[PDB]
Write a protein that holds these residues in place. Structure first.
Motif, PDB file in Angstrom:
ATOM      1  N   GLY A   1      15.757  15.120  -8.990  1.00 35.15           N
ATOM      2  CA  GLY A   1      14.770  15.408 -10.060  1.00 35.15           C
ATOM      3  C   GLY A   1      13.313  14.546  -9.306  1.00 35.15           C
ATOM      4  N   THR A   2      12.126  15.011 -10.540  1.00 37.04           N
ATOM      5  CA  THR A   2      11.105  14.232  -9.799  1.00 37.04           C
ATOM      6  C   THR A   2      10.852  13.367 -11.134  1.00 37.04           C
ATOM      7  OG1 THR A   2      10.507  16.258 -11.211  1.00 37.04           O
ATOM      8  CG2 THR A   2      10.417  16.533  -8.670  1.00 37.04           C
ATOM      9  N   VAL A   3       9.952  12.735 -10.751  1.00 35.59           N
ATOM     10  CA  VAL A   3       8.728  11.240 -11.917  1.00 35.59           C
ATOM     11  C   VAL A   3       7.931  11.730 -12.355  1.00 35.59           C
ATOM     12  CG1 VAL A   3      10.475   9.827  -9.710  1.00 35.59           C
ATOM     13  CG2 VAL A   3       8.009  10.266  -9.769  1.00 35.59           C
ATOM     14  N   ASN A   4       7.460  10.677 -13.198  1.00 35.84           N
ATOM     15  CA  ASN A   4       6.223  11.114 -14.117  1.00 35.84           C
ATOM     16  C   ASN A   4       5.579   9.729 -14.422  1.00 35.84           C
ATOM     17  OD1 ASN A   4       6.353  13.969 -14.820  1.00 35.84           O
ATOM     18  ND2 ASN A   4       7.880  13.589 -16.303  1.00 35.84           N
TER      19      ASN A   4
ATOM     20  N   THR B   1      17.837  10.814 -17.757  1.00 33.14           N
ATOM     21  CA  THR B   1      16.592  11.446 -17.144  1.00 33.14           C
ATOM     22  C   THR B   1      14.852  10.441 -16.904  1.00 33.14           C
ATOM     23  OG1 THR B   1      15.032  13.288 -16.752  1.00 33.14           O
ATOM     24  CG2 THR B   1      15.856  12.791 -19.047  1.00 33.14           C
ATOM     25  N   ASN B   2      13.839  10.975 -16.252  1.00 35.72           N
ATOM     26  CA  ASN B   2      12.656  11.266 -15.942  1.00 35.72           C
ATOM     27  C   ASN B   2      12.295   9.131 -15.686  1.00 35.72           C
ATOM     28  OD1 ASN B   2      12.482  12.879 -18.871  1.00 35.72           O
ATOM     29  ND2 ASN B   2      12.269  13.049 -16.799  1.00 35.72           N
ATOM     30  N   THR B   3      13.803   8.072 -15.839  1.00 35.85           N
ATOM     31  CA  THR B   3      13.377   6.549 -15.898  1.00 35.85           C
ATOM     32  C   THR B   3      13.083   6.667 -14.129  1.00 35.85           C
ATOM     33  OG1 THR B   3      13.852   4.127 -15.821  1.00 35.85           O
ATOM     34  CG2 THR B   3      15.939   6.222 -15.612  1.00 35.85           C
ATOM     35  N   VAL B   4      12.373   5.441 -13.479  1.00 32.87           N
ATOM     36  CA  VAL B   4      12.399   5.199 -12.046  1.00 32.87           C
ATOM     37  C   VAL B   4      13.511   4.511 -11.584  1.00 32.87           C
ATOM     38  CG1 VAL B   4      11.179   4.185 -10.538  1.00 32.87           C
ATOM     39  CG2 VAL B   4      10.410   5.417 -11.530  1.00 32.87           C
ATOM     40  N   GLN B   5      14.506   4.523 -10.500  1.00 35.54           N
ATOM     41  CA  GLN B   5      16.043   4.054 -10.036  1.00 35.54           C
ATOM     42  C   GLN B   5      15.138   2.513  -9.747  1.00 35.54           C
ATOM     43  OE1 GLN B   5      18.547   2.935 -10.084  1.00 35.54           O
ATOM     44  NE2 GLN B   5      19.219   4.266  -9.731  1.00 35.54           N
ATOM     45  N   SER B   6      15.180   1.512 -10.411  1.00 33.25           N
ATOM     46  CA  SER B   6      14.986   0.425 -10.555  1.00 33.25           C
ATOM     47  C   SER B   6      15.360  -0.649 -10.549  1.00 33.25           C
ATOM     48  CB  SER B   6      13.652  -0.283 -11.348  1.00 33.25           C
ATOM     49  OG  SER B   6      14.222  -0.070 -13.105  1.00 33.25           O
ATOM     50  N   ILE B   7      16.378  -0.892  -9.626  1.00 30.58           N
ATOM     51  CA  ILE B   7      17.051  -2.218  -9.269  1.00 30.58           C
ATOM     52  C   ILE B   7      16.692  -3.100  -7.875  1.00 30.58           C
ATOM     53  CG2 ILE B   7      18.831  -0.346  -7.103  1.00 30.58           C
ATOM     54  CD1 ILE B   7      20.831  -2.513  -8.377  1.00 30.58           C
TER      55      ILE B   7
ATOM     56  N   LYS C   1      17.923  11.863   0.693  1.00 31.18           N
ATOM     57  CA  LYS C   1      18.366  13.112   0.513  1.00 31.18           C
ATOM     58  C   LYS C   1      18.012  14.033  -0.069  1.00 31.18           C
ATOM     59  CE  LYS C   1      21.977  10.802  -1.822  1.00 31.18           C
ATOM     60  NZ  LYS C   1      22.938  11.156  -1.817  1.00 31.18           N
ATOM     61  N   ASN C   2      16.532  14.703  -0.403  1.00 31.26           N
ATOM     62  CA  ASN C   2      15.988  15.937   0.497  1.00 31.26           C
ATOM     63  C   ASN C   2      14.796  15.868   1.255  1.00 31.26           C
ATOM     64  OD1 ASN C   2      14.563  14.628  -1.683  1.00 31.26           O
ATOM     65  ND2 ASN C   2      16.083  15.917  -3.507  1.00 31.26           N
ATOM     66  N   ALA C   3      13.781  17.152   1.704  1.00 30.01           N
ATOM     67  CA  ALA C   3      12.505  16.845   2.054  1.00 30.01           C
ATOM     68  C   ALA C   3      11.677  16.403   1.623  1.00 30.01           C
ATOM     69  CB  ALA C   3      12.510  18.350   3.368  1.00 30.01           C
ATOM     70  N   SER C   4      11.549  16.479   0.563  1.00 30.48           N
ATOM     71  CA  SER C   4      10.467  16.668  -0.931  1.00 30.48           C
ATOM     72  C   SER C   4      10.016  14.877  -0.849  1.00 30.48           C
ATOM     73  CB  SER C   4      10.570  17.147  -1.483  1.00 30.48           C
ATOM     74  OG  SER C   4      11.053  18.406  -1.438  1.00 30.48           O
ATOM     75  N   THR C   5      11.535  14.549  -1.002  1.00 30.16           N
ATOM     76  CA  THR C   5      10.947  13.353  -1.998  1.00 30.16           C
ATOM     77  C   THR C   5      11.834  11.792  -1.251  1.00 30.16           C
ATOM     78  OG1 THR C   5      12.767  13.250  -3.243  1.00 30.16           O
ATOM     79  CG2 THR C   5      11.475  14.249  -4.201  1.00 30.16           C
ATOM     80  N   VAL C   6      11.454  10.450  -1.888  1.00 34.02           N
ATOM     81  CA  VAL C   6      12.219   9.663  -1.406  1.00 34.02           C
ATOM     82  C   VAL C   6      13.851   9.429  -1.368  1.00 34.02           C
ATOM     83  CG1 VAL C   6      10.199   9.105  -0.281  1.00 34.02           C
ATOM     84  CG2 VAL C   6      10.073   7.924  -2.127  1.00 34.02           C
ATOM     85  N   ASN C   7      13.655   9.822  -2.683  1.00 33.20           N
ATOM     86  CA  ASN C   7      14.750   9.449  -3.689  1.00 33.20           C
ATOM     87  C   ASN C   7      16.069   8.784  -2.918  1.00 33.20           C
ATOM     88  OD1 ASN C   7      13.318  10.755  -6.020  1.00 33.20           O
ATOM     89  ND2 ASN C   7      14.713  12.261  -5.825  1.00 33.20           N
TER      90      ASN C   7
ATOM     91  N   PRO D   1       0.534  -1.153  -0.227  1.00 33.70           N
ATOM     92  CA  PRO D   1       0.192   0.335   0.318  1.00 33.70           C
ATOM     93  C   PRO D   1       1.056   1.357  -0.342  1.00 33.70           C
ATOM     94  CG  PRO D   1      -1.089  -1.571   1.751  1.00 33.70           C
ATOM     95  CD  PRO D   1       0.396  -2.286   1.731  1.00 33.70           C
ATOM     96  N   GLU D   2       0.441   2.259  -0.690  1.00 34.19           N
ATOM     97  CA  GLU D   2       1.273   3.526  -0.977  1.00 34.19           C
ATOM     98  C   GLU D   2       2.648   3.424  -1.041  1.00 34.19           C
ATOM     99  OE1 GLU D   2      -2.221   6.252   0.892  1.00 34.19           O
ATOM    100  OE2 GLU D   2      -1.371   5.790  -0.983  1.00 34.19           O
ATOM    101  N   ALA D   3       3.030   2.640  -2.708  1.00 37.85           N
ATOM    102  CA  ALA D   3       4.128   2.293  -2.696  1.00 37.85           C
ATOM    103  C   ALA D   3       5.197   3.517  -3.143  1.00 37.85           C
ATOM    104  CB  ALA D   3       4.638   1.444  -3.042  1.00 37.85           C
ATOM    105  N   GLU D   4       5.221   4.092  -2.884  1.00 39.94           N
ATOM    106  CA  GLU D   4       5.389   5.686  -3.587  1.00 39.94           C
ATOM    107  C   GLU D   4       7.404   5.539  -4.058  1.00 39.94           C
ATOM    108  OE1 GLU D   4       5.042   9.138  -0.943  1.00 39.94           O
ATOM    109  OE2 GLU D   4       6.813  10.737  -2.364  1.00 39.94           O
ATOM    110  N   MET D   5       7.158   5.795  -4.998  1.00 38.15           N
ATOM    111  CA  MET D   5       9.197   5.526  -5.686  1.00 38.15           C
ATOM    112  C   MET D   5      10.142   6.610  -5.437  1.00 38.15           C
ATOM    113  SD  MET D   5       7.173   2.477  -8.817  1.00 38.15           S
ATOM    114  CE  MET D   5       7.244   1.330  -8.200  1.00 38.15           C
ATOM    115  N   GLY D   6      11.497   6.222  -6.293  1.00 35.60           N
ATOM    116  CA  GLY D   6      12.318   7.202  -6.337  1.00 35.60           C
ATOM    117  C   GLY D   6      12.808   7.653  -8.190  1.00 35.60           C
ATOM    118  N   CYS D   7      13.301   8.929  -8.090  1.00 36.58           N
ATOM    119  CA  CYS D   7      13.883   8.919  -9.615  1.00 36.58           C
ATOM    120  C   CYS D   7      15.058   8.678  -9.569  1.00 36.58           C
ATOM    121  CB  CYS D   7      13.704  10.532  -9.770  1.00 36.58           C
ATOM    122  SG  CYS D   7      13.944  10.677 -12.155  1.00 36.58           S
TER     123      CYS D   7
END
Lengths: 59, 251, 285, 59, 59, 251
Positions: free
Chosen positions: B129-132, B153-159, C257-263, B118-124
């Motif tokens: 940067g930010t995800v799309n 760019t624009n891909t999710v870090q997916s290892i 990494k920063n306060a906004s994301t889960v990066n 539940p609520e699986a928030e992912m990183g770039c």
């Protein structure tokens, strides 16, 4: 174990709390914030003869 | 004890090699009650046109496969009348039954983990940067985990080891899950209730949960055994409700 | 009136005595494919004596685990400068800038509680060539602005009237200021993770910043003084109480990494050793 | 409202207090300063056979 | 006067305390440090059919 | 008395201007019983994945429109899991709920007949000839009645007065039917049970009934009233059963 349970201050229109005393002297206890008595007649009506308030004050 | 049958709407699933059924936190799906509602209009409840098994498209489990994920909802937005009821309302609410199938012979080996997060928030892959949303989901097609660190760019870090969330992948057993061990069973089944911090929500804006399929022991076989081994997912909504009827949105 | 409240103590299970066995019961054979964790105790696999266990799980409850104060913000502000924006401090409220409390909170998806807030303020003299003066005690003002209220432009702005905003006035040399805050959110519980967007077209702002929106804090000196400049630092401490949490999660492995994301940057699972059999020898003459 | 009332520490030769719990976790409660038990025989007399103290220890 | 008296945390092998609530809001009360419940089966045994633990898991 | 609601599966229909509901011969659909069965294998019953409302595509009612017909089944062979269960089995059985919608303003006029005809066998425009299946049906698209006598080869004799069956069109009221009179109501509803001389049958080979929509009073309107007036059909199967599972047929 010498626990006191009393009601909390709420509004009007689960609500109690617990206290234990830790020290041997009563000067160490917390303040008595929940005692609300009144006696205004001591300052506003300090007369020997009673005054009815629907009757005249004199005569 | 290993045979099971599940009926919903006009659809039925049979299985002869099941382990058991996981009920996410001991809670079955149900409708919203009166002392927990906030929206005031009368809701619609289709009840057999939406609550039935839909099958997605399959993936191929190869000898070096990192794994796959889907996002729910938004994987069923083009599925029959469930998708149409999603497009005309502002608020929706539903639980789910998930069923994953993968069969093989007694001369194959491999082990898969099937988990709902539940609520699986992912990183770039770029930390500044930010995800799309295209990198998060492709509807009924699966996204693919990777084998090493990703870049560009624009891909999710997916290892796979970090599960794209900055955690250890071996701890994902804290969520509702099952295993498919090719020598033991050939299907997994999870029953998920509605889980959110508000009683209803908009189904285009918020992904309620992610489904992850990750092999821990790769697929192996010998001289002339079958090489093609597919995996298939099938999902059925339960106790589906909608509120706030207006004209159809357009993505 | 006095009311007696009873407190149930909760201890761990005793181990029972067990002897030899030869039967068809196989407590040690299971199947992890079901998603079920085995409930076997030592008395099912070996011979045991009876032990009365008096240990209690009291310090691992959620309330005792989370009810401590942690720093969440630190900031600086001057009494005299040439910028007029460095004369007061201001920040948006959250718990994402100090990693200890924020990793501790992120073990769960949703949380609900009241808060106790404490402030620790210190001052110091700015390095000048000529020293020596006596200064009266300094007074500080802290104002909380909920979203939508007017924003101060300087240290003499009318907005410090604080007619409806709650403020604290404090003077140095006293106990640190403290006040409690109830559970203030338009939802039924706080959200630590949000896998969604702000716009219905599935774009805009992603993740946590969509949902918090809890106002700002502004802090200034009240004296408006000091021909020789001074500098103050303010630190804020949170302490949750009357807690409830839902849906546990795996603890954060990678660094923030920063306060906004889960990066994150990809990290290993652990550190290495020599080989799968390596044993450190410790019994040597 | 869930109030506990218990006795205060005094001397020997009005004396109780009240407590309310405000938080959901028990790790937030104050210390348990009023529990006084003892069991010294665990360290001073850890022998299998009982020793009477008016009898000889041996023989 | 709305006092709560409850037992203190002690060991094993005079012990109670008193609390009074001073404020009108329950968000002002102190933490609830003395509630110890558990329900682990929600996370360790979330299966539809019960598993006995002396029987085989399958067959 | 004019408002009605019908729920099936995950689908619901509301209406505010209904007349009543026709139950074909006083008989509601039901499952096959044990003292009337002949096939011995255990049947499958999906029950919410198949028993729900499917909507076909609409037709345009113009000032000179002769009418339309559909054939059932074979109009639902590409509809979700009902069609998939049709493709993998040899025998099927189901009743139906039919709902026809057409709304217009209080300044329009016109009258439609909605009728279901069991075993509607049709004739060719060449009397020394035979029909083919393309001339009988186009799936979810409607066939069109004609305005005069038809000619040429391989087409069905489709002048409306004979209904393509060699009868008088004014006698079709012997079958289950309703009327849509634009000043009175805006929808028709018919509940049809399973009607055949054998308890089950193959669903690709045999058309169980034809749905006919025939205007008796043409559409009329005045100066600046709306000109576009569509008609829409929606059908839901009920008590659906299948027998004889094998590999999927191919048309």
């Amino acid at each position: 174990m010498g626990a006191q349970v009393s009601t909390q201050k709420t509004g009007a229109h689960i609500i109690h709390y617990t206290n234990i005393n830790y020290y041997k002297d009563a000067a160490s206890n917390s303040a008595n914030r929940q005692d609300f008595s009144q006696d205004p007649g001591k300052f506003t009506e300090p007369v020997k003869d009673i005054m009815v308030k629907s009757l005249p004050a004199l005569n | 004890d290993r045979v099971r049958s599940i009926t919903l709407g006009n659809s039925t699933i049979t299985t002869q090699e099941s382990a058991n059924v996981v009920v996410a936190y001991g809670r079955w799906p149900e409708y919203l009650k009166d002392n927990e509602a906030t929206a005031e209009d009368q809701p619609t409840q289709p009840d057999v046109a939406t609550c039935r098994f839909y099958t997605l498209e399959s993936v191929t489990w190869e000898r070096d496969s990192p794994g796959w994920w889907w996002k729910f909802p938004d994987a069923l937005k083009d599925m029959g009348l469930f998708g149409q009821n999603m497009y005309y309302h502002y608020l929706g609410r539903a639980g789910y039954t998930i069923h994953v199938q993968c069969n093989a012979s007694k001369f194959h080996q491999g082990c898969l983990m099937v988990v709902c997060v539940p609520e699986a928030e992912m990183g770039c892959s770029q930390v500044d940067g930010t995800v799309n949303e295209h990198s998060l989901s492709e509807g009924e097609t699966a996204k693919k985990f990777a084998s090493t660190s990703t870049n560009g760019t624009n891909t999710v870090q997916s290892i796979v080891t970090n599960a794209g969330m900055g955690v250890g992948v071996g701890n994902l057993t804290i969520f509702p899950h099952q295993w498919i061990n090719l020598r033991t069973n050939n299907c997994a089944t999870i029953v998920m209730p509605y889980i959110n911090n508000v009683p209803m929500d908009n189904m285009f804006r918020h992904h309620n949960f992610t489904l992850m399929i990750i092999p821990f022991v790769p697929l192996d076989y010998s001289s002339d055994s079958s090489t093609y081994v597919p995996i298939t997912v099938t999902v059925a909504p339960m106790c589906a409700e909608y509120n706030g009827l207006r004209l159809a949105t357009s993505l | 009136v006095v009311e007696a409240v009873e407190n149930a103590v909760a201890r761990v299970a005793d181990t029972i005595s067990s002897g030899p066995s030869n039967s068809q019961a196989v407590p040690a054979l299971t199947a992890v494919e079901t998603g079920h964790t085995s409930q076997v105790t030592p008395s099912d696999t070996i011979q045991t004596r009876h032990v009365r266990n008096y240990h209690s799980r009291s310090e691992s409850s959620i309330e005792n685990f989370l009810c401590r104060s942690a720093c969440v913000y630190m900031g600086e502000y001057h009494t005299t400068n040439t910028d007029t924006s460095k004369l007061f401090a201001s920040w948006t409220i959250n718990a994402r800038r100090m990693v200890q409390m924020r990793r501790k909170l992120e073990l769960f998806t949703y949380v609900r509680f009241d808060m106790e807030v404490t402030f620790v303020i210190t001052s110091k003299q700015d390095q000048g060539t000529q020293l020596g003066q006596d200064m009266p005690p300094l007074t500080h003002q802290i104002m909380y602005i909920p979203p939508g209220g007017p924003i101060p432009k300087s240290v003499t702005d009318y907005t410090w009237q604080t007619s409806t905003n709650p403020s604290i006035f404090w003077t140095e040399g006293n106990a640190p200021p403290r006040m409690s805050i109830p559970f203030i959110s338009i939802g039924n519980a706080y959200s630590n993770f949000y896998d969604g967007w702000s716009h219905f077209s599935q774009n805009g702002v992603y993740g946590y910043n969509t949902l918090n929106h809890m106002g700002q804090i502004y802090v200034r000196h009240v004296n408006g003084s000091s021909p020789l400049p001074m500098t103050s630092t303010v630190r804020m401490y949170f302490k949750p109480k009357h807690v409830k949490v839902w849906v546990p999660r795996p603890p954060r492995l990678c660094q923030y990494k920063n306060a906004s994301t889960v990066n994150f940057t990809p990290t290993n699972i652990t550190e290495k050793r020599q080989s799968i059999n390596y044993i450190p020898e410790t019994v040597k003459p």
